[PDB]
Structures are given as C-alpha cells and as structure tokens.
Design an enzyme around this catalytic site. Structure first.
Site, short mmCIF file in Angstrom:
data_model
loop_
_atom_site.label_atom_id
_atom_site.label_comp_id
_atom_site.label_asym_id
_atom_site.label_seq_id
_atom_site.Cartn_x
_atom_site.Cartn_y
_atom_site.Cartn_z
N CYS A 130 0.79 -1.21 0.00
CA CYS A 130 0.00 0.00 0.00
C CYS A 130 0.83 1.28 0.00
CB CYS A 130 -0.89 -0.05 1.21
SG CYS A 130 -2.33 0.99 1.21
N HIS A 173 -9.38 -4.14 -3.39
CA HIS A 173 -8.40 -3.34 -2.62
C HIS A 173 -8.74 -1.84 -2.56
CE1 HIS A 173 -4.14 -2.56 -1.14
NE2 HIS A 173 -4.61 -1.37 -1.44
N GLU A 174 -9.01 -1.24 -3.71
CA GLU A 174 -9.49 0.12 -3.87
C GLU A 174 -10.89 0.41 -3.32
OE1 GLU A 174 -6.99 1.87 -4.29
OE2 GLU A 174 -5.75 0.29 -5.17
N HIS A 177 -10.77 0.90 0.34
CA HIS A 177 -10.28 2.23 0.73
C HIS A 177 -11.41 3.24 0.90
CE1 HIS A 177 -5.97 2.04 1.04
NE2 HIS A 177 -5.79 1.59 -0.19
ZN ZN Z 1 -4.12 0.71 -1.26
#
Ligand code: ZN
Ligand code: 6JT
Ligand code: ZN
Ligand code: ZN
Ligand code: ZN
Ligand code: ZN
Ligand code: ZN
Ligand code: ZN
Ligand code: ZN
Ligand code: ZN
Length: 203
Positions: A130, A173-174, A177
């Site tokens: 990250c 993953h995004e 966020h």
């Molecule tokens: Zn990330």
C-alpha cells in the site's frame, strides 16, 4: 483544501500527496459523488489516472519519485469521495512482444461497489502492499476470487462488470479504501499464512 492543490492544471500527483497510515481519512466511509460531476471531481479522476500511468512509466516514475502502482483511491489523497482509478497492465511475452491489450483494466470509477461475488476466496501469493503503508506486512490478504461490480464513469453512465484474477484483487483493494478498510484487516490475526482449504492462491 487538498482538492484545490490536486486540481491546479500544472499539478502532478506524487508521493507527497499520499496520506499515511494513521490519518483518520483512511478509516472513514467516503461520500457518494452526485452526477453531473463537478469540474473538480472530474479533474481529480484524471489526475489519479495520470498518477498511475506515471508510476508505471520508467522515466516519470524516476522524475517524480513514484513507486509502481495499479490502483489509487481518493481517500489516499485526503479526499473522502467514492472515486478510484485502476490501471492493470498486461505483460510482454518471452520474445519481448507487447500484449494485444496494453491493460487488462483501465478505468476511473465513481461510486463503485461489489454487488455479488464468489463463495471462493483468493489471495495474492506475494501479499499486498500500500502507498499509505511504509511497513513490511507479510501474509495472505483474503479476498473474493470473483466479483461483480457496478460503478459510474465520469459521464454518469452506469457499468456492470464481472472480474476475476488480478483485476478482481485490485478493485476489491481500492473499494475497501472508500469504505475505510486497510489490506491488513483481511490478514489472519494469528497465522498470516494460514490457508483455509479452497483458497485460490494467485502467482
Ligand atoms: Zn491501497
Ligand atoms: O496502495 C495502493 C497501491 C497497491 C494496490 C494494490 C492492489 C492490489 C494489491 C495492491 C499497489 N501496490 C503495488 N502495486 O499496487 N492502492 O490503493
Ligand atoms: Zn503534490
Ligand atoms: Zn451522503
Ligand atoms: Zn476532462
Ligand atoms: Zn504524463
Ligand atoms: Zn465482500
Ligand atoms: Zn457477500
Ligand atoms: Zn444493480
Ligand atoms: Zn491484524
């Protein structure tokens, strides 16, 4: 405000724009964007995409001090909006020939979400990294193998898409966020490399 720095015409996103582990914005649920987009939200998406292109260009990565990257969420730039960019490259063959498609996935996504997924789980065999995390975090980040996502592009047009493989891992993953979830939240607390049977390990 952060967004005002980011959208100046001459501004290029680099690592000094990326907030770090500990900053409360990474733990919020991002705000839905409304259509039509403001000028800012549109320019922000293009900048984020520009950043990922730059990070994958050997020259610009070196000019800007950028580490190679395939996704970026607006929370990472201190902007609590449901905006991600994904740029997943295809690879050359053993002979050195470019792929037919430069990218398996190239998109700026507004309000993306997982609408359905597989019972099967998958993990990158190499762990995950990250931009906001300056630590070595070992272990399998357990994700869905396959997802169906919906999202809007910058015209306000709605897309429904199924993903598997690396594209699926990237997008999950995004999206995480914009929900305040960090990758290490999906790593086993007691054994980082615990494999539950059926887990698709991606090489
Ligand atoms: Zn990330
Ligand atoms: O922090 C990042 C970058 C991360 C994305 C990932 C998507 C999947 C795994 C990492 C990245 N690190 C190295 N390449 O990309 N994205 O939010
Ligand atoms: Zn900057
Ligand atoms: Zn709201
Ligand atoms: Zn534009
Ligand atoms: Zn450029
Ligand atoms: Zn899920
Ligand atoms: Zn579910
Ligand atoms: Zn739907
Ligand atoms: Zn933990």
């Amino acid at each position: 405000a952060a967004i005002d720095k980011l959208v100046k015409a001459s501004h290029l996103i680099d690592m000094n724009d990326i907030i770090r582990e500990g900053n409360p914005t990474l733990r919020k649920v991002a705000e839905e964007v409304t259509f039509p987009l403001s000028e800012k939200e549109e320019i922000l998406g293009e900048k984020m995409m520009q950043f990922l292109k730059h990070s994958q260009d050997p020259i610009m990565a070196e000019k800007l001090g950028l580490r190679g990257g395939v996704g970026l969420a607006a929370p990472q730039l201190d902007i609590s909006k449901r905006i991600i960019a994904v740029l997943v490259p295809n690879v050359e063959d053993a002979q050195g020939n470019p792929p037919k498609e430069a990218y398996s996935l190239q998109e700026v996504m507004y309000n993306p979400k997982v609408v359905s997924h597989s019972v099967q789980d998958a993990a990158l065999s190499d762990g995950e990294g990250c931009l906001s995390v300056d630590r070595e975090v070992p272990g399998y980040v357990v994700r869905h193998a396959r997802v169906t996502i919906e999202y809007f592009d910058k015209t306000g047009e709605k897309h429904r898409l199924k993903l598997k493989g690396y594209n699926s891992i990237v997008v999950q993953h995004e999206i995480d966020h914009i929900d305040g979830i960090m990758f290490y939240d999906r790593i086993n607390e007691k054994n980082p490399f615990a494999v539950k049977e059926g887990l698709l390990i991606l090489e």
